[PDB]
């Protein structure tokens, strides 16, 4: 009731000191399907469960390639996902064109945080409402980042976002020491990710239509497997 008076826009604090529009934007992530990311000292992988409108429709794209050494997966709104993926592509292209340099994953996370913070303190727009998982390989090795649209970025060994992602996150926490040491064997890491995302399923089974995988590594350019390319991992 009292929250109803102080949640008009992002330039208003409640009398208790709460910014409710940003909290609602954060809550918007739960409306998207689950994505899992993980990595070892050599490779980083993303696993995504895709959804279709109905039987006659296609499945949504959950994994987007940014550059030959970096990519991401989405959970949340579609427009903000499109905007942020295009922005990251532009930043990687600028780095390559101007410096002949590969954009670092940490730099991409910082740029995303800077762009996301702006919409949460000025009137006339809205905060973003998408969580992102960013995998990459650079001069410091393999990297996985979690971006929250409040303007936050965290570096983790593994994580999951989306609806009912708590089970996958718990599984990743329990078995950290196992997949943290899978070096030089992409298949084992991908299977560990698939098993992790299997914990978040509810009355659902992974198929060749609703499963998407992505991998990046030292000698592996960022590659996306869809359809029959994931049939071996089921």
């Amino acid at each position: 009731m009292f929250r109803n008076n102080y949640d008009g826009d992002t330039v208003t604090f409640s009398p208790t000191g709460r910014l409710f529009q940003v909290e609602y934007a954060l809550e918007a992530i739960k409306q998207g399907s689950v994505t899992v990311g993980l990595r070892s000292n050599t490779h980083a992988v993303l696993v995504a469960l895709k959804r279709n409108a109905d039987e006659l429709s296609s499945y949504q794209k959950k994994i987007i390639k940014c550059d030959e050494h970096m990519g991401l997966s989405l959970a949340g709104l579609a427009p903000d996902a499109r905007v942020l993926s295009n922005y990251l592509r532009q930043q990687c292209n600028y780095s390559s064109l101007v410096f002949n340099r590969k954009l670092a994953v940490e730099r991409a996370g910082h740029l995303l945080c800077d762009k996301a913070q702006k919409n949460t303190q000025s009137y006339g727009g809205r905060p973003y409402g998408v969580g992102l998982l960013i995998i990459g390989y650079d001069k410091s090795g393999a990297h996985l980042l979690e971006f929250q649209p409040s303007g936050n970025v965290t570096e983790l060994y593994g994580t999951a976002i989306g609806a009912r992602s708590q089970g996958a996150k718990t599984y990743l926490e329990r078995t950290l020491d196992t997949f943290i040491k899978i070096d030089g064997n992409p298949d084992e890491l991908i299977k560990a990710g698939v098993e992790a995302i299997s914990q978040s399923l509810r009355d659902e089974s992974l198929t060749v239509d609703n499963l998407s995988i992505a991998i990046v590594g030292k000698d592996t350019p960022f590659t996306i497997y869809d359809g029959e390319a994931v049939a071996k991992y089921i």
Binding site: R3, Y6, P15, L19, V22, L26, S150, N152
Partner: protein, 244 residues
């Protein structure tokens, strides 16, 4: 005396009723549920004082609360009405006065009305003294009420619901004979979080001794529903990406 709050700006009267029914929970018990034909219907749990006192609902097999409830205080002999929802339309206000409130007054042989006004909507200039906050009256434009010199108003607009309530009470062809006087307390305020505003309004009403039987309140207690006024009680800790 029967206390009838009105659904007005800031929900200040209703909130005040909560204070009155939780700061002195010992003297108050749930009495009756009135008909809610002209209100938006409401079903919910039973509210209790925050400090841990016993619920005003003494019956053990009742687990639900309706939109319009009447509580009674036998030690002071005071009747209070808690209304959860506004009227379906203003047109039915007359019905609400004629077929609901007046039968109760006649049935219990009751021998005030709490309200708030928004200054920006004062299209008839009834606010003659903006310096003061409250107004107390006792019994186009109407002059049927005698407001104290310290009140912010001396008349009431015909657009206000209080005029319709007064007209229905006075012009009733079979109004109860036991009804003697009418008291009308109103305050000027602005929308927002009006818990402290309601507390101050109740303090002013009690200090002015508008109701003789009303005892002073020293320790104010909220119900437990107010803890959910900003959503989940422990929601702030959930957003680890925002607060640190």
């Amino acid at each position: 005396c029967l206390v009838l709050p009105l659904v007005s700006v800031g929900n200040i009267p209703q909130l005040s009723i909560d204070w009155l029914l939780n700061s002195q929970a010992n003297e108050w018990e749930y009495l009756e549920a009135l008909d809610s034909k002209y209100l938006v219907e409401f079903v919910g749990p039973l509210d209790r004082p925050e400090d841990g006192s016993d619920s005003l609902y003494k019956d053990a097999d009742m687990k639900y609360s309706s939109a319009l409830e009447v509580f009674y205080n036998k030690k002071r002999g005071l009747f209070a009405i808690q209304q959860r929802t506004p009227l379906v339309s203003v047109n039915y206000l007359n019905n609400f006065i004629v077929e609901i409130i007046l039968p109760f007054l006649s049935k219990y042989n009751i021998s005030c009305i709490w309200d708030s006004l928004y200054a920006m909507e004062d299209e008839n200039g009834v606010i003659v003294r903006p310096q003061e906050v409250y107004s107390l009256g006792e019994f186009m434009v109407n002059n049927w009420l005698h407001f104290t010199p310290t009140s912010f108003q001396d008349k009431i607009s015909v657009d206000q619901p209080i005029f319709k309530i007064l007209f229905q009470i006075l012009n009733a062809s079979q109004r109860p004979k036991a009804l003697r006087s009418i008291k009308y307390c109103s305050c000027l305020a602005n929308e927002g979080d009006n818990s402290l505003d309601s507390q101050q309004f109740l303090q002013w009403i009690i200090s002015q001794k508008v109701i003789k039987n009303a005892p002073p309140i020293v320790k104010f207690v909220r119900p437990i529903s107010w803890q959910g006024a900003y959503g989940m009680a422990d929601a702030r800790d959930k957003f680890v990406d925002l607060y640190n």
